[PDB]
Design a protein around this ligand. Structure first.
Ligand code: MG
Ligand code: MG
Lengths: 349, 349
């Protein structure tokens, strides 16, 4: 309440009022998802081209499945009904053919910490990758950064951590569905800034006797453990309690390294500070779950020079990646399967 | 200390070691300052074209000044020594002509809070603006964000706030000089993240009896008060103690509003949250100094639509701005003098 500071309130009132001007913008979000174009159609020959399958596996499965009930997807082109198999169609075929799902080879939840200085987009990528469907992946993305991941949609992760909810509530009330059926998101908000700020205090008041850095693991990860193969944690750079919760609940650090000689140094400085961050956990008497790290490149002088530099710092934990649709989409795909293979590499080995 | 988490330490050690690969990059910073090109040369006719001056004012001052000692700057082109007046030359002329400096009309330190979601660049702009030299501005930029402003150079602001230093130490040890002689910077670091995190705690231990939100004002602003006309505060979005210190020590909120319909909403959400932030100060028993706000545009569908929207929310506190050198440089200049005029407008009125 004073004069023009009593006017910041004025701009605020008008800002929230124009935020209602937003329904006109929600339809713009679909303009961004229309570019994703994901309702891939699969011709029986393509499916037969997939891993562990063949023109004869597809046909036997299709016939067999068709017979006990199952109804595959079809399109009516011209006057003929061609088969257009969906991701679930292909996924069920692998199940009919009895190929083991990822959840049949690996004990529940592998947690990944993504270094922010894109994530849901990676999660979507891993789920719908041709040579990866056989795994039937279940991925959840936890948003502990007051901004981006919540973009993919039709109670924040911070709130849920404090509300101390049970698996049934998390499953049916907090965890929200993304545009891709296999990937789920627990959203973030600006308002998480206030929680991140008064964390320990709020912890002591609502979660008595619980360690302030085991709360991500305790109240979410562990309660949704049998539900997801991969769990990606998205946080800001700046934050520390929320950033520390991610470092204590994750198994693998995933560090994306920018080509710009400008950003390459930011990342380098960031990475140079993680040890001190782990020590704060150690001081609280909590063991970090970290057991593996991976770093890659993206995106002319800088790029070409940065890639050869990352090898120096990441050593054996470095990867590759990026005319536009044909070429790039492909380059991207190759990256995804690269990331998956590395996780598999560092995991059950 | 465990296994591959005991390997994050490994990457860190190698990262800091490649950060020494940096002297090779410091010379790259000048590649960015060589584009600024600031050692403007002034021909006597140009100077005569400036405000409150004329071919006869310049000549009388030059002659007069030259006579009692003063030595103006000159260049040796071909075989003739033309006059190339510097910013100080023009500044001293106005002083000889007895035109009042900004520090002669306004009581010391007007503090500005810049909303981050560029600052030093604005400070440099205001200082060296042709029609603004007559003011002989003294500007300081406080960095309370773990990143950007420190870019312009040849003890962080966070540390100085805790060290509780006196004006002589701040003047001669913490405040560093920018590339432009009139603008000074108090740098930030990644390490401010740890301080921002354990603020109240650290405050209570090192600054007993001092209010945790009056520390920016108390330990820096007030001790450098007679030294600067404008003081810009640069902070992150995320931070809260450091962000609250800025809101309690500033007179004017300067909000730059992005054209992208994507970012325009981020800003809108941000602005919609300032009131709650002021209340936290109110709760600590501290009165915010905020007394004026200003918002502008920058940078095709979004832009053209956003500008007409900003008028709706900012009302009377909105401004204008942005082939490339001629046209743009000009457009930029016009913006700067626009910003100055608005500050003057909201100030002594
Ligand atoms: Mg423990
Ligand atoms: Mg007070």
């Amino acid at each position: 309440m004073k004069r023009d500071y009593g006017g910041v309130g004025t701009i605020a009132l008008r800002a929230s009022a124009l935020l209602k001007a937003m329904s006109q913008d929600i339809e713009d979000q679909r303009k961004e998802f229309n570019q994703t174009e994901y309702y891939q159609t699969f011709t029986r020959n393509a499916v037969a081209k997939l891993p562990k399958l063949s023109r004869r596996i597809v046909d036997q499965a299709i016939k067999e499945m068709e017979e006990d009930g199952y109804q595959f997807n079809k399109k009516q082109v011209g006057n003929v009904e061609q088969y257009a198999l969906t991701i679930q169609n292909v996924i069920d075929i692998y199940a009919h053919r009895k190929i083991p799902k990822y959840r049949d080879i690996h004990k529940s939840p592998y947690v990944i910490f993504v270094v922010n200085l894109s994530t849901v987009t990676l999660a979507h990528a891993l789920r719908v990758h041709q040579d990866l469907l056989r795994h039937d992946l279940r991925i959840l993305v936890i948003d502990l950064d007051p901004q981006a991941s919540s973009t993919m949609f039709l109670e924040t992760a911070a709130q849920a951590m404090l509300n101390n909810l049970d698996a049934e509530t998390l499953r049916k009330e907090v965890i929200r569905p993304t545009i891709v059926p296999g990937v789920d998101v627990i959203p973030a908000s600006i308002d998480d800034g206030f929680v991140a700020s008064q964390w320990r205090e709020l912890v002591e008041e609502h979660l008595p006797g619980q360690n302030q850095y085991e709360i991500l693991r305790r109240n979410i990860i562990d309660r949704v453990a049998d539900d997801y193969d991969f769990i990606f944690i998205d946080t800001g750079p700046h934050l520390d309690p929320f950033l520390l919760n991610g470092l204590a609940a994750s198994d693998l650090l995933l560090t994306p390294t920018p080509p710009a000689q400008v950003d390459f140094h930011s990342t380098l400085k960031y990475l140079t500070r993680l040890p001190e961050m782990l020590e704060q956990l150690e001081e609280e008497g909590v063991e970090p779950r970290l057991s593996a790290s991976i770093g890659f490149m993206s995106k002319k002088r800088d790029h070409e020079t940065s890639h050869s530099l990352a090898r120096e710092v990441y050593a054996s934990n470095i990867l590759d990646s990026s005319e536009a649709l044909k070429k790039a989409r492909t380059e991207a795909e190759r990256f995804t399967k690269a990331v998956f293979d590395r996780i598999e590499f560092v995991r059950g080995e």
